[PDB]
Amino acid sequence: GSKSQYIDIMPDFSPSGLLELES
Amino acid sequence: GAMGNEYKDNAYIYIGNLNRELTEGDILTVFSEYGVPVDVILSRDENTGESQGFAYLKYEDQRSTILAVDNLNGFKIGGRALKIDHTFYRPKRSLQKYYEAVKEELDRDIVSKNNAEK
């Protein structure tokens, strides 16, 4: 698991808009 | 040397199972209602970054805690009613880049430091 043993997570602030249809 | 270790600043609110389609941007957008931009932690897979569905938001303000918890508890986001619980967690520096990346967006506000010049 050469590429499964790395740990890197970078927060991604994206707008889905899922809540737009109810707000 | 006292940093205020007895003061639980590492306190935050726990958000329950959210839509996999919801990202950190959406999460911050929801909390933008209160206008309080502080730490936000989304449980994402360590390899592919898959939204595990667990969200956390650390903001420092006792008033705002009880407010947001009661206010958002039962609020629907994409069909998912927000279940807000109380919890505390200390961000390890081994994962500082994650929290730092969060404050990267908050830096636009953090630039304003207390005490205006001399």
Side-chain angles (χ1 to χ4, degrees):
Chain A
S2 53
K3 69 180 189 65
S4 190
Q5 59 183 30
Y6 56 49
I7 309 295
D8 65 277
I9 313 171
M10 298 272 70
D12 179 66
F13 294 84
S14 299
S16 64
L18 305 170
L19 52 77
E20 190 68 68
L21 286 306
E22 65 181 292
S23 305
Chain B
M3 295 177 58
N5 298 33
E6 302 189 80
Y7 296 82
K8 304 159 188 168
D9 78 288
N10 53 88
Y12 60 66
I13 57 175
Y14 168 66
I15 298 77
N17 307 90
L18 295 181
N19 296 90
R20 68 169 187 178
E21 299 298 299
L22 288 168
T23 63
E24 301 86 295
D26 304 281
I27 302 178
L28 183 64
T29 290
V30 174
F31 296 116
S32 188
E33 174 65 87
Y34 305 109
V36 189
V38 213
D39 293 279
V40 58
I41 312 164
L42 174 59
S43 305
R44 303 186 67 160
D45 181 271
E46 305 82 81
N47 296 152
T48 173
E50 282 293 286
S51 305
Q52 309 182 275
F54 323 101
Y56 315 99
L57 180 84
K58 177 272 182 79
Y59 55 86
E60 226 299 279
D61 190 79
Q62 183 174 329
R63 300 163 297 196
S64 305
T65 64
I66 310 154
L67 190 164
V69 174
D70 183 83
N71 273 30
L72 292 176
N73 198 330
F75 191 81
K76 287 61 166 187
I77 294 295
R80 294 295 303 166
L82 305 175
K83 293 84 181 182
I84 314 298
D85 303 293
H86 285 256
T87 180
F88 62 99
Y89 159 71
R90 294 73 65 205
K92 60 270 185 175
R93 192 158 305 262
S94 184
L95 189 63
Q96 68 178 331
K97 295 190 301 178
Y98 182 94
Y99 313 108
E100 186 186 272
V102 175
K103 74 87 177 296
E104 282 288 284
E105 295 295 283
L106 313 179
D107 184 74
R108 63 184 299 185
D109 176 79
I110 305 301
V111 67
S112 180
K113 299 170 292 297
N114 61 87
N115 287 271
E117 57 186 61
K118 299 79 175 183

